Write an enzyme that holds these catalytic residues in place. Sequence first.
Site, PDB file in Angstrom:
ATOM      1  CG  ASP A  65       4.451  13.774   9.987  1.00 32.69           C
ATOM      2  OD1 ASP A  65       4.393  14.955   8.545  1.00 32.69           O
ATOM      3  OD2 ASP A  65       4.537  12.465   9.802  1.00 32.69           O
TER       4      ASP A  65
ATOM      5  CG  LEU B 292      -2.228  -0.903   1.254  1.00 29.86           C
ATOM      6  CD1 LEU B 292      -2.230  -2.031   0.608  1.00 29.86           C
ATOM      7  CD2 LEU B 292      -3.012  -0.523   2.500  1.00 29.86           C
TER       8      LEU B 292
HETATM    9  C1  LIG Z   1       0.363   7.539   2.918  1.00 31.54           C
HETATM   10  C2  LIG Z   1       0.296   6.900   4.810  1.00 31.54           C
HETATM   11  N1  LIG Z   1       0.072   8.286   5.572  1.00 31.54           N
HETATM   12  C3  LIG Z   1       0.384   5.614   5.282  1.00 31.54           C
HETATM   13  N2  LIG Z   1       0.861   5.138   6.724  1.00 31.54           N
HETATM   14  C4  LIG Z   1      -0.847   4.489   6.511  1.00 31.54           C
HETATM   15  C5  LIG Z   1      -1.500   4.609   7.755  1.00 31.54           C
HETATM   16  N3  LIG Z   1      -2.623   3.690   7.892  1.00 31.54           N
HETATM   17  C6  LIG Z   1      -2.800   3.128   6.629  1.00 31.54           C
HETATM   18  C7  LIG Z   1      -4.909   2.550   6.452  1.00 31.54           C
HETATM   19  N4  LIG Z   1      -4.604   2.627   8.450  1.00 31.54           N
HETATM   20  O1  LIG Z   1      -4.932   2.534   5.850  1.00 31.54           O
HETATM   21  C8  LIG Z   1      -2.837   3.452   5.952  1.00 31.54           C
HETATM   22  C9  LIG Z   1      -3.420   3.595   4.314  1.00 31.54           C
HETATM   23  C10 LIG Z   1      -2.645   3.543   3.151  1.00 31.54           C
HETATM   24  C11 LIG Z   1      -2.832   2.883   1.651  1.00 31.54           C
HETATM   25  C12 LIG Z   1      -3.092   3.238   0.325  1.00 31.54           C
HETATM   26  C13 LIG Z   1      -3.964   2.895  -0.160  1.00 31.54           C
HETATM   27  C14 LIG Z   1      -4.827   2.864   0.549  1.00 31.54           C
HETATM   28  C15 LIG Z   1      -5.422   2.214   1.506  1.00 31.54           C
HETATM   29  C16 LIG Z   1      -4.460   2.510   2.234  1.00 31.54           C
HETATM   30  N5  LIG Z   1      -4.510   2.904   3.915  1.00 31.54           N
HETATM   31  N6  LIG Z   1      -1.476   3.830   5.360  1.00 31.54           N
END
Ligand SMILES: C[C@H](N)CNc1cnc(C(N)=O)c(-c2cc3ccccc3[nH]2)n1
Length: 266
Positions: free
Chosen positions: A121, A15
């Site tokens: 952040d 992701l």
């Molecule tokens: C870039 C972000 N700040 C990286 N940290 C996180 C933290 N939590 C999530 C989550 N709890 O869905 C995701 C997340 C990334 C993502 C990308 C595509 C689809 C669903 C996704 N969920 N990314």
Amino acid sequence: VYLDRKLLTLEDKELGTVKKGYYQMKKVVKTVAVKILKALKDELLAEANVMQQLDNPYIVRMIGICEAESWMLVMEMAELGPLNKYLQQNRHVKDKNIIELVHQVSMGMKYLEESNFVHRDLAARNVLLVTQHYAKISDFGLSKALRADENYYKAQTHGKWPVKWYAPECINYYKFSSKSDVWSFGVLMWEAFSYGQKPYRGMKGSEVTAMLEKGERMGCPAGCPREMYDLMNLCWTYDVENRPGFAAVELRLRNYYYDVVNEGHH
Ligand SMILES: C[C@H](N)CNc1cnc(C(N)=O)c(-c2cc3ccccc3[nH]2)n1
């Protein structure tokens, strides 16, 4: 807080590391987003320690932690991913919908402020979308629980910092408070109304600090309501004492959002 590795099924894909998975709950199966830690151990545990203390509809919930191949921080999944990437790919999203999402972030931040945690952040990459109409704040790796006797966190050394989202007192005095998160929230609003464009385009961190010290601020994004740009400028109040807190910011956004909903019904 301690999860069973046998009850977690991870997908091969990436992701962001952050991976998608499924966790077997008491009955239902829950889709999850898992931060994989492929000092660094302590950092992930401190992020988990912050998340366990938070309970709000506009903050990503931690399911728990697991120590297996690597240390893993298991979170609820926000299926649509980061707000900046979503808006870059969905330029049709209406101003009313953007106001709705930034107001939800202000509700989560009003709660974080009431809880005496500083995010440190807050940026559009750290707002995740559950649906096109439901945002949650994530990424508490730099977050701090304020001491009972102080309203700020004093960083010891200037580290690998997201300078373009930092208030002048963060840069000049290393002081982080809910008011410095308000400054970052103004930058997040600018990113949201700019459909996920990066702030201070083409400028180095030192040039941004110099610009802000000259009293200069980013211009109004195309199609951004004047009331929203005025609120971004209020978040970018140089002096901490005169900058609004999240209760005042959330109230402004809440009332504006009701005005736009009313205009929509008319
Ligand atoms: C870039 C972000 N700040 C990286 N940290 C996180 C933290 N939590 C999530 C989550 N709890 O869905 C995701 C997340 C990334 C993502 C990308 C595509 C689809 C669903 C996704 N969920 N990314």
